[PDB]
Design a binder for this molecule. Sequence first.
Ligand SMILES: CCCCCCCCCC(=O)CC(=O)N[C@H]1CCOC1=O
Lengths: 55, 55, 232
Amino acid sequence: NTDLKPLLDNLRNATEFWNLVKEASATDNRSYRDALDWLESAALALGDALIAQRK
Amino acid sequence: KPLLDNLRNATEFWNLVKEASATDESTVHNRSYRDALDWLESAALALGDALIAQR
Amino acid sequence: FLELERSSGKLEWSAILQKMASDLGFSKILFGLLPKDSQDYENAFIVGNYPAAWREHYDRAGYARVDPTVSHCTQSVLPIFWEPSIYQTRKQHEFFEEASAAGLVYGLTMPLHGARGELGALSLSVEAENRAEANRFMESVLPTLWMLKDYALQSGAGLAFEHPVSKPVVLTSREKEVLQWCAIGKTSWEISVICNCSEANVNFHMGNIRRKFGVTSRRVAAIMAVNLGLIT
Ligand SMILES: CCCCCCCCCC(=O)CC(=O)N[C@H]1CCOC1=O
């Protein structure tokens, strides 16, 4: 089934953005922090929705 | 599938440590600040990369 | 740059504009937007970091009728630069003198015309020692800010005329402490030595702060709190 939680795609964009920023090897950042902040905030947002399971 | 529960447990651990971070003035540093942060990234990274293989 | 983070809230979306304007080099930024067949400039979606005293004087004096940039936006899609040649009439001359007292001397405005008929303007002001230095800087970042005008118009058109009910936020003494230090530009490690905490401690607190505001970045949440008079 397809639930009413279009958050998995949000995390997909946050992880893919982290996946794009991780490719900049040897560049010598504010973009790394925002990528990590988005990854934590998106995963945490899913988790709060992923605990309202109700058996 | 066996990644969503990891994020569910990491978020609840993050949610439990967030109540402990405002129930007694810190004094709960230990490994718990790092591991709660460390666990959230690992769960999102494993789950997120799996959500990109499904075009 | 390309971290085109477009939120679902007016306050965060406004914070990201201020964050991008300061990153590009501009001191002040204003975003105005009007619905399709509306001509009431006072009752318009206006956000940014302009001086609140100037914005209040601007609306009370009805400066939208005298302001040459809003007149330019109704007839063109090309930018207009804050040059002395744009102020022609006597009322526009007084408008320029008083606007400078508010700090809006050098800058430019990008006319906004949305797909569903929206009319608006995106203004950015720069601080410089002379107009020649200001004109040289705005010409360097003119192509990149030309893209920002269309991205802010497409993302802002959906959140401009809604009325979402924001839920009030309250932070702990520690959370409000580390947030004001992050607002001035201190990175996570630097706040750890000031507040005498671990770096994982401040990173843990910013994560909770970002969930309370509903944002996905700490710098955006930091300027949001000062917009509601929460810090500094
Ligand atoms: C199409 C206009 C929609 C409603 C916009 C209301 C006007 C808001 C003021 C503005 O556009 C910024 C601005 O024009 N700044 C100019 C004028 C004052 O200082 C400047 O240099």
